[PDB]
Design a protein around this ligand. Structure first.
Ligand SMILES: CC(C)c1c(C(=O)Nc2ccccc2O)c(-c2ccccc2)c(-c2ccc(F)cc2)n1CC[C@@H](O)C[C@@H](O)CC(=O)O
Ligand SMILES: CC(C)c1c(C(=O)Nc2ccccc2O)c(-c2ccccc2)c(-c2ccc(F)cc2)n1CC[C@@H](O)C[C@@H](O)CC(=O)O
Ligand SMILES: CC(C)c1c(C(=O)Nc2ccccc2O)c(-c2ccccc2)c(-c2ccc(F)cc2)n1CC[C@@H](O)C[C@@H](O)CC(=O)O
Ligand SMILES: CC(C)c1c(C(=O)Nc2ccccc2O)c(-c2ccccc2)c(-c2ccc(F)cc2)n1CC[C@@H](O)C[C@@H](O)CC(=O)O
Lengths: 421, 421, 417, 394
């Protein structure tokens, strides 16, 4: 019954028929005969999963092994929340095993932390650290700063002019004018002190603001564009070269994030009694400190590290981020961490530990946190979506949990390194 | 209905009954008030999936919102390959949308690149970069170096002693003995030149070797332990402080990975016709160059970046890594990239572009690549598993694809920023 | 004689002036007089230096080592008890001149203290291409010396509490008052702080008139922290410098926040001047600048070293002008940019940006007269009464401009090959 | 000749757009010509120039010479280092620097002295070349990594001078660029000129094999010379040195006015954690640069190389039976230094080198005087670290 191209095409152009009245083979025949662009399937096909299905069938016949997608799942997933929002040219989804570490005893609460990973022993090891913390009387944490950033680059005709623009942005009245434009774009937009850097006739401007419970890239970028249109009214010779001049800095290693912070800056701490260090972690405080000093400080220093003074913060950050619908590529900077270990108590046998993470780039609204499975892991922690009565409290609480879980991970791994084998 | 626990323990310890004869609520009554821990539920329960269900039921009772897990899926997933290998305390899986970006024309072949992301526009943006590359005669790439590392820290009583060890490791005879011990642990263990660094009585030793198509952490760590054991025979006063002293460096930013490389060092390039830059990319060669210089070089430099001279290599690396079963936490170093752009061709109006990525930590055997869904994405690229006839070729080919896709991604985002929205 | 000379020292009116070199030395070597009691006894300075040298020479494996180390006819009254100790002489560093440097409508003759052959010549040629291109323009973007003490509290909860308190309007005010009350020029600008667990690193920043500022800022810092201790008695002042300043070590914080004077400088060199003076083209200069000072420094893992040889110029000027040459570590931070300019993109636009020039025209080695002469050549010696800090700012601009002259010349030579 | 003219007459000849037979008079006449351009022409009055030996300076160390700058020189010592005693000259104008370093020497002396070792030794130059394509630059890297490619490059490099002896190459690609780090010992000279000449002929030989290669610049900043760079910290440059000492508890208390415990706490939290929060690469120390700079000016070194030469990590630990003694070490991977050439050619500079017993070439073992000076520098840096850190902890 597969009809000729010309007949299939009239059915397609017929608005009370459409693709729903053609078979997969007929649509594919139309695509291979160059009557439909391979990507405009998503508009023509009236169901999301069939769109995916036909794209897979088309993709398959181009591969060296036609059956390579057999075990890539696609059926019965909620593509409604993904198409035109989270992903394109969708051919399925990738299941990432989710484990749980906890309870994490943090700020007199208890958290069951979801961790999506394929690295064996990471969840178990993280769970052991949680245990040491819990029996040690818990951890305490504080958010020290909060504000996503965007660092556009603009160019003036001369460096004397860029200098003029910088000095102008630093006057109370010049800043206030830029602040008004930025803050007008959203209810959470609240431009903080500006940070600028001249390189010749370039000027890098680092816009920073809270963003409620959203991670904030989009909002900040909208506030930035409006802020710059306003600056351009005062300086019409200014050229806006790029809305991002890598001065943010987003998803690249950069000392500015380490020193100034980006997103949430957090510190977490705990004192593990000697007894717990022995029974849970199978070592002594002395051996843990000797390793922390010579690995996480001296080792990282010999390797030429900026911000990597920790054992495996990235493991925890990455696992939580994938689980909780974060942007996993932001683990580059969000993993920044210095882990400190000191002797405590009357005989120096208790272990004071802290982790400091100045650039946790996190959110509980928007992006991947819109998807229901990701929301389940957020609900687990009690941080899903916006916080009505105290905006930001859910993103802040998630950042504290990330730092606290990183600390658990540091305890366990460092203990294992200290003992051996 | 639930019966006394003592009777439940007879039924469980009975070899021809087991947990199958007990109820959900019965297993749970036994977990509460001890007898079974919770993680050993797997090594105890009839099926993997029922272990997950029991674990979810236990977890749910501890949460402030009992229905939190409702949309976290878990049924019909292949847990057999996960339990004891890739994750612990498993409560389900996290679906990550997977899109396809291609064809990527690389080294006179074509690749359909799977990307697992929740960032809107990322896959479409990358696909546009692939298209511009495709129309410009395609991309070329080369693997420059290959060797996973591990960087233990050892201590001697004095710095004069650590110096003696460093000097002995630098003789031909000293290295040969260490190499023999290292190489005996595995067929792929072939120790390359040692890199050593002293900090007083500390000595950091960076062991480097290829590892077939495996990412190679496990294998190198194994080789390192036997090498250090051999070294201790010659220097009995040496203490091995930690098998990783952060000198490797794994999952933390470090100039050593940027300078010496880690895993695969790759370069990719292409020339995009001036016509394509206008039609496909909506900008000019002159505009692309000016953005690249002032964003990816000058901007990254003003930010204090080591290795982050790029627009968003982390986006592409992260998405390929999740889709293909890599360790996503390694995006920290694997994202290291310098993107360069200049004028090319007769008119000098065509865009030359290269991406250099010195530390792509990757593999097609082990960890997450043992799972079937992530194997499907590896099969798309033709790089699933070990290459019998040419060990390591698959992992090398995957690194080349990553670098090329990164360049595609760099091309499209840099155009969008250059066009000004 | 041993006992006869002892009676001469003890007589308040006589003194060691009535003794010879050999006599004092006999006293020390027989253990009649402790050797450390020579600064106090000997009344004159050059003779002190001379006796110290003679005593020292007997302990060297070559007693004639100091033959050619000069020490005579130098003003040790401005050195003793201020700039140097256990002084045995002075080290002459050749001073050459590069100029005229046409900077902000003025013309400077820049003194450069060095022993590297061709450095003054090359820098001179840079100045010459700048002069034939219409001069250079510069601006001071910021000014403020820092000191970055480390304090600790019993817990990270406590350090976080202190950090929030210092960020309140009221808390800053109280700290600013204690800091500002130590000196006329001490005016505390915003604080920059970082927590590392129960540690708190506090970066105090302030202008300092025409002085480099180290001492002044360090005294203001101490009184400020004393005030903080009244609000937080559990706070331990671990060290007045916790390396957060950061002084005399490489540090991204100086590169990003600045330290001392942050400065920019620029110029345009006509195509003809690049060919005839610099022996290259604009196209070649740009090419080398991109691939050496940006890409090359990037491949080497540089923070703040995006330049050819700013350190050469900074160092030479610093030694000549009585600066703390050790501060060349941070003061040399520099990014050099080069792009095409003019009608047919044939002119060379150049700029240097130096965010952490640590500098002064008053205090320390700028108190010595030879150093003051070099400062006077530039017209920046000492404090500016009508506009505090102006002489220090001017010098910073001259360093940045001279650096640019140097980059122009050296890059031209590298490009020509 | 010019002797049969006057100062005013030669100057009148120079102004009219139209040589002298004594060096000191050339300097006088240059000062007088320059005086005409300054707003205060009497500013030069107290810049000395008389009775200095300009014969070794002109056409070697400085051009357009108008005089010299006296820098005060103090002595820190004795420094007990590797069973010898050194009287270290330090040229500085920073009050207390020499007195403080001197206290550190004293503490080291009373703890049985310091021990040092040179871990690596070779000056570098890091040219940048480009090739048509990244594929061609990759091919050149592969070629340079073969034993046969390296041998031909080595032969070419080693032909340029006595001491040219090429060690392992280090390379990095950036697209069609290739950065090639050449490393070699250079006798007792710092060696820049020697390595640059060697590098030129090596690159010339490379061009024979790869005709499409362009030599963009003899230094592509990959060396790296006189700029901060992680490559020097990780690979070393010039002399890599380590030094150490154990200071008895009693001596930490009586001389340094503190305790081993307090010293350790400040070192960890200042030199490690603080430098780390500041974003430091290689600056894990209190003030190595004060010492390096002071010794460098006094001993005729290139003071601009304090940028890389000051790289230092200072470590401190508890030591001894009762864990009350202070183990201290400093590690300096990139001391760029020499005892022949440059400012070491001058007699006053040679005076300070002779105090140390390292002046000029070591005829027995070429390069041994430079190694010794690096060891002394690392030892004196450790002295300075000890004292300043004790002052901060106290
Ligand atoms: C947390 C995971 C699971 C973990 C553990 C770990 O925590 N194990 C572990 C403990 C208790 C309870 C159960 C368990 O599985 C250990 C380890 C350390 C010692 C003895 C034995 C194992 C290692 C391990 C580490 C380093 C090595 F050289 C070899 C192995 N890793 C892998 C960590 C990597 O993803 C990052 C790491 O490379 C970062 C770094 O340190 O540079
Ligand atoms: C999702 C893609 C990768 C994407 C695109 C993009 O490729 N879009 C795009 C494609 C085809 C055709 C048209 C189109 O607009 C753009 C973009 C850039 C210009 C105009 C408009 C949008 C932006 C974007 C960039 C910067 C902003 F300030 C706001 C948005 N992003 C997000 C990039 C981030 O994940 C990393 C980024 O933060 C890294 C950095 O540059 O620092
Ligand atoms: C300014 C000095 C005097 C200078 C010049 C220079 O500018 N010469 C010069 C010009 C006009 C007029 C007279 C003259 O002597 C040159 C040079 C470069 C090419 C051709 C010819 C010379 C070189 C030189 C540089 C690199 C080499 F590999 C060999 C030599 N140097 C030494 C610079 C160093 O102190 C710093 C340098 O190492 C920093 C870096 O680039 O990484
Ligand atoms: C060695 C010099 C002379 C020295 C000493 C010093 O060691 N003094 C000293 C000792 C024995 C014997 C006599 C004496 O004068 C001290 C100091 C520190 C505490 C109490 C007392 C003094 C300070 C000092 C340091 C920091 C301050 F915030 C205020 C002062 N400085 C200046 C050092 C600078 O050039 C570099 C420094 O900034 C590097 C850094 O630490 O970040």
């Amino acid at each position: 019954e597969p009809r000729p191209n010309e007949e299939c095409l009239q059915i397609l152009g017929n608005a009370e028929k459409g693709a729903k009245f053609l078979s997969d083979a007929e649509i594919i025949q139309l695509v291979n005969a160059k009557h439909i662009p391979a990507y405009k399937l998503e508009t023509l096909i009236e169901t999301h999963e069939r769109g995916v299905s036909i794209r897979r069938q088309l993709l398959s016949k181009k591969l060296s092994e036609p059956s390579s997608l057999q075990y890539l799942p696609y059926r019965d997933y909620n593509y409604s929340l993904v198409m035109g929002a989270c992903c394109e040219n969708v051919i399925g989804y990738m299941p990432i095993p989710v484990g749980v570490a906890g309870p994490l005893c943090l700020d007199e609460k208890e958290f069951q932390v979801p961790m999506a990973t394929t690295e064996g022993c990471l969840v178990a090891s993280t769970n052991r650290g949680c245990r040491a913390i819990g029996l040690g009387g818990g951890a305490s944490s504080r958010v020290l700063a909060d504000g996503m950033t965007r660092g556009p680059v603009v160019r003036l005709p001369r460096a004397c002019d860029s200098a003029e623009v910088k000095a102008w942005l630093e006057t109370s009245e010049g800043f206030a004018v830029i602040k008004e434009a930025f803050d007008s774009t959203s209810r959470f937009a609240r431009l903080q002190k500006l940070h600028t850097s001249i390189a010749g006739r370039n000027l890098y401007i680092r816009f920073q603001s809270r963003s409620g419970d959203a991670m904030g890239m989009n909002m900040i970028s909208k506030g930035t564009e409006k802020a710059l249109s306003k600056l351009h009214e005062y300086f019409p010779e200014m050229q806006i070269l790029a809305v991002s001049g890598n001065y943010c800095t987003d998803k690249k290693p950069a000392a500015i994030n380490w020193i100034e912070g980006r997103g949430k800056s957090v510190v977490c701490e705990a004192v593990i009694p000697a007894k717990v260090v022995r029974e849970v972690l199978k070592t002594t405080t002395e051996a843990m400190i000797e390793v922390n000093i010579n690995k996480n400080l001296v080792g990282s220093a010999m390797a030429g590290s900026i911000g990597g003074y920790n054992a495996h913060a990235a493991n925890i950050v990455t696992a939580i981020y994938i689980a909780c619908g974060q942007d996993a590529a932001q683990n580059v900077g969000s993993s920044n961490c210095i882990t400190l270990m000191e002797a405590s108590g009357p005989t120096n046998e208790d272990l004071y530990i802290s982790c400091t993470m100045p650039s946790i780039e996190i959110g509980t609204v928007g992006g991947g946190t819109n998807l229901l499975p990701q929301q389940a892991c957020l609900q687990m922690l009690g941080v899903q979506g916006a916080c009505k009565d105290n905006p930001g409290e859910n993103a802040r609480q998630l950042a504290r949990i990330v730092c606290g879980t990183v600390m658990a991970g540091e305890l366990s791994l460092m203990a294992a390194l200290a003992a051996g084998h």
